[PDB]
Design a protein around this nucleic acid. Structure first.
Ligand SMILES: [Mg+2]
Length: 94
DNA sequence: ACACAAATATTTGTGT
DNA sequence: ACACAAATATTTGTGT
């Protein structure tokens, strides 16, 4: 149906915070979004590219090696970018 | 969006 | 059958 009101940055931040170890792979981010938001079960090419692009562009998502590919985590300075927990409004940079 | 490299995964080929 | 190497395919990550 309609696309949810959350930005790609909010979606990634939801997935990272939802992981028990606060670290998650890229496919884990795909699965999180598709499980909770049916709009993203279609045309995966497009938005999954936008997910990868948002992971590399924004400093707030830092890549970390494992112990498949790599774990994505939140910079602690940006862990609560969405202060009220609704993920509708994002705090701006210090 | 695009192109593209780098890193992994899968399929195919060869020898025994 | 197996082990293993080559070659391809796919995913992951980065740069305008
Ligand atoms: Mg980044």
């Amino acid at each position: 149906g309609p696309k949810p009101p959350y930005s790609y940055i909010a979606l990634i931040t939801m997935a990272i915070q939802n992981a028990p170890e606060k670290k998650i792979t890229l496919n884990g981010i795909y699965q999180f979004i598709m499980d909770r938001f049916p709009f993203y079960r279609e045309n995966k090419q497009g938005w999954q590219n936008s997910i990868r692009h948002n992971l590399s562009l924004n400093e707030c998502f830092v890549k970390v090696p494992r112990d498949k590919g790599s774990y994505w985590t939140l910079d602690p300075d940006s862990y609560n970018m969405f202060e009220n927990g609704s993920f509708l409004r994002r705090r701006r940079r210090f």
